[PDB]
């Protein structure tokens, strides 16, 4: 989940 927590 490396896209702003998602």
């Amino acid at each position: 989940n490396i896209i702003x927590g998602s």
Partner: antibody
Amino acid sequence: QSVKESEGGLFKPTDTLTLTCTASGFSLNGYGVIWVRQAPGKGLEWIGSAGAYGRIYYPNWARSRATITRNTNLNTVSLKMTSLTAADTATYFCARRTNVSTSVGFDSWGPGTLVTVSS
Amino acid sequence: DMTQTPSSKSVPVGDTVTINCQASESVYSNNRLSWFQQKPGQPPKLLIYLVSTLASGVPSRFKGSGSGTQFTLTISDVVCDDAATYYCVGYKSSTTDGLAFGGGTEVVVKG
């Protein structure tokens, strides 16, 4: 609806720089916050980012000497940098991103705070 | 790694200028790319987010385009007010080295 960096000023080499990003008219909690600096006559340089959902990420050069912390109680984001040199003399900016969906659509920029590390 | 070329470009008033931005690796979802305008002594200003969407209050003579590893900012009908340095910022992830700033392109307007 603006962000502001705390006071910089005069530092000796080997000092520690501590800066706080404060918001007025909206919130920093839940929004991405970035730290950028600009040495005299040079380009913008990323220092690190406070993700909107808790993750803190840096460029490699900064990961050893910079640490970035969020305070959701006080609605602030802070930057601490160790082992200062004259090369760290620059204007330091913080900025807020309204929409996470843009990732780097950084919207509200502070006026910048001047940091002089004098040899 | 974002490479911006050229470092500097002079453009006559009224002409069109194009600023190039080379991402060594494609930005996330092919669209995490923003453009900024900075005049000396001032904070940066957001011009375009998501490759081509203009920020509010930005005139339509600014045009962002590109995809993958290559992006362009086009300023038509250049005025002296456009004298500034322009930056692209690309995002890949929320990790180490996971966003990058271009080195900037200084636009000198010839009056």
